[PDB]
Amino acid sequence: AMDNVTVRQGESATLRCTIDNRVTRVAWLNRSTILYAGNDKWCLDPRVVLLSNTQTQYSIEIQNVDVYDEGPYTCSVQTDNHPKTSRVHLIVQVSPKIVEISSDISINEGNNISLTCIATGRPEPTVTWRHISPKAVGFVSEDEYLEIQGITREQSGDYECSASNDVAAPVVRRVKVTVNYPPYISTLQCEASAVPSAEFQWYKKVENRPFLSKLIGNYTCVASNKLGHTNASIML
Amino acid sequence: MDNVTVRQGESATLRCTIDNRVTRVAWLNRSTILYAGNDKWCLDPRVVLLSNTQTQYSIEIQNVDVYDEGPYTCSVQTDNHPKTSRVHLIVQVSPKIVEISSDISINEGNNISLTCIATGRPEPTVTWRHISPKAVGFVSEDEYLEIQGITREQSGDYECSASNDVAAPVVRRVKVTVNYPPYISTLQCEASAVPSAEFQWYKKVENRPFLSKLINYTCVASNKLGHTNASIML
Numbered sequence: 001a002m003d004n005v006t007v008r009q010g011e012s013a014t015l016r017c018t019i020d021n022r023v024t025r026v027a028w029l030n031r032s033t034i035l036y037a038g039n040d041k042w043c044l045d046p047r048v049v050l051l052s053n054t055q056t057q058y059s060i061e062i063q064n065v066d067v068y069d070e071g072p073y074t075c076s077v078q079t080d081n082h083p084k085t086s087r088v089h090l091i092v093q094v095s096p097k098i099v100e101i102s103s104d105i106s107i108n109e110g111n112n113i114s115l116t117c118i119a120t121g122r123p124e125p126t127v128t129w130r131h132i133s134p135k136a137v138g139f140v141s142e143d144e145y146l147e148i149q150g151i152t153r154e155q156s157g158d159y160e161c162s163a164s165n166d167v168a169a170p171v172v173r174r175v176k177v178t179v180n181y182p183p184y185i186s187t188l189q190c191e192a193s194a195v196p197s198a199e200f201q202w203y204k205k206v207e208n209r210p211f212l213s214k215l216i217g218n219y220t221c222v223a224s225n226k227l228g229h230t231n232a233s234i235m236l
Numbered sequence: 237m238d239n240v241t242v243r244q245g246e247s248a249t250l251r252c253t254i255d256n257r258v259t260r261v262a263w264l265n266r267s268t269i270l271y272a273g274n275d276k277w278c279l280d281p282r283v284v285l286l287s288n289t290q291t292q293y294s295i296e297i298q299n300v301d302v303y304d305e306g307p308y309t310c311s312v313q314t315d316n317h318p319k320t321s322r323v324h325l326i327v328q329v330s331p332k333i334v335e336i337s338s339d340i341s342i343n344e345g346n347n348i349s350l351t352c353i354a355t356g357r358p359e360p361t362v363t364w365r366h367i368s369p370k371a372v373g374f375v376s377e378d379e380y381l382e383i384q385g386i387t388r389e390q391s392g393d394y395e396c397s398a399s400n401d402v403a404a405p406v407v408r409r410v411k412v413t414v415n416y417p418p419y420i421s422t423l424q425c426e427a428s429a430v431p432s433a434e435f436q437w438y439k440k441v442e443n444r445p446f447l448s449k450l451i452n453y454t455c456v457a458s459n460k461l462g463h464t465n466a467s468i469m470l
């Protein structure tokens with residue numbers, strides 16, 4: 001005749017037991033074991049402290065509760081006509097915690113990559129992957145295990161893992177992915193995009209910005225990185 | 237894995253071995269506490285303290301009923317580790333035959349069927365016995381007994397026997413009578429019939445039920461099922 005009780009890990013749980021009329025003796029039990037009988041402290045664990053022994057209600061408190069303390073707890077009352085008992089289930093909760101994620105990586109285009117996010121908590125959290133890359137389309141997925149086949153430069157960016165249960169606010173940790181792709185070329189200027197940023201070469205001074213180079217007959221622009229090389233020519 | 241079993245209306249002894257020293261010990265009936273040390277929690281007098289020594293704590297449950305069946309735990313409190321000892325109490329009821337088939341009369345070569353439903357703890361063993369002398373043996377080891385093409389040789393009482401090994405088995409019998417047309421075997425003709433046939437001579441006189449006596453002629457015995465005549469000439 002009493003509502004379930006639920007507390008977070010490392011908190012205090014109060015187990016109350018309302019009484020009426022007159023009762024000879026009252027007790028609290030942890031499964032079969034006895035915790036308190038009247039004002040007699042059976043179990044010697046200091047976390048269990050008696051709170052109220054007035055006839056109106058009999059209540060104890062469990063401090064610094066762990067998940068192992070979850071289970072049924074009965075308030076064994078004894079009355080002359082019939083003996084009554086009231087069972088109460090203690091439910092412990094653990095905030096979600098991301099135990100493992102893949103470390104930050106840089107990868108060549110067109111390879112197989114994989115991302116994982118192992119999270120713990122009580123109850124089991126719901127893990128989701130989000131593509132956090134700005135200035136690009138994103139996506140959310142309900143797969144803990146995330147695989148990418150034939151990775152493209154369009155898929156570079158951060159990947160945020162989120163593990164959530166109703167116990168606490170979801171916890172997030174992200175991983176930045178940078179995708180390596182050979183350069184593609186786009187007074188005299190030569191625009192190109194590459195990861196890592198490509199060093200330009202001009203062939204028959206010159207200021208080299210990170211995203212483009214400029215030069216102040218027919219000449220060719222050569223853009224190159226560790227993966228490959230491209231040449232583009234322009235005539236003035 | 238401790239276990240105890242007692243018959244209804246008897247006394248059951250619940251022992252609990254302990255070692256070293258325990259602050260307080262108890263015996264429990266499911267969730268409720270019966271005794272804690274020398275403190276009598278439950279108000280039922282049937283649970284009496286037997287041993288309050290430190291080495292062992294034992295109680296006894298007298299006048300046990302079927303409602304007293306269930307688990308009983310010996311809640312110990314020790315500093316090093318907490319131990320509990322559960323014991324399952326098992327109550328027993330002598331077998332009781334709730335239902336049997338009523339007596340029947342049947343024509344020879346007909347179908348009959350008999351049942352003997354018995355209850356008890358533990359499960360009783362029901363057996364059917366044909367009480368006709370020179371019998372073969374038990375006829376069914378189940379509640380249900382059926383006979384196909386019943387013969388006059390199978391008429392008689394059928395004893396059901398239910399035993400659960402708790403107490404002496406209870407038995408009840410049912411008589412079946414098989415109807416058969418008469419068959420014949422100064423002038424006497426012996427014959428057998430169910431119902432018993434009255435003899436007639438055709439062509440005083442004392443006619444016993446199982447044979448007739450006369451003080452070309454035929455002796456006629458007949459009943460509700462059929463008729464036969466056997467003739468002899470002097």
Ligand SMILES: *[C@@H]1O[C@H](CO)[C@@H](O[C@@H]2O[C@H](CO)[C@@H](O)[C@H](O)[C@H]2NC(C)=O)[C@H](O)[C@H]1NC(C)=O
Nearest residue numbers: 083265266268278280282283297301303304306
């Ligand atoms: C042992 O505990 C039970 C339950 O608290 C006592 O009461 C009976 O419980 C059964 C449930 O299985 C009910 O059907 C009965 O009506 C209850 N009352 C009685 C009088 O049987 C039981 O009495 C306890 N045993 C003893 C010896 O007190």
Ligand SMILES: *[C@@H]1O[C@H](CO)[C@@H](O)[C@H](O)[C@H]1NC(C)=O
Nearest residue numbers: 002003004005088089090091
């Ligand atoms: C309390 O929690 C237990 C956990 O198994 C559940 O079985 C029970 O129904 C719950 N009771 C209420 C009142 O929610």
Ligand SMILES: *[C@@H]1O[C@H](CO)[C@@H](O)[C@H](O)[C@H]1NC(C)=O
Nearest residue numbers: 030031045068069070071318
């Ligand atoms: C008894 O209570 C303790 C904490 O008070 C808890 O850890 C344990 O799981 C409970 N049940 C037992 C010991 O069977």
Ligand SMILES: *[C@@H]1O[C@H](CO)[C@@H](O)[C@H](O)[C@H]1NC(C)=O
Nearest residue numbers: 110111112113148149150151
């Ligand atoms: C990537 O995964 C596919 C899956 O079938 C496999 O066939 C291939 O060998 C893997 N490696 C590559 C494409 O380099």
Ligand SMILES: *[C@@H]1O[C@H](CO)[C@@H](O)[C@H](O)[C@H]1NC(C)=O
Nearest residue numbers: 345346347348382383384385
């Ligand atoms: C008797 O039982 C037999 C076999 O089970 C069945 O064929 C028949 O219909 C039953 N009734 C009779 C013979 O009157």
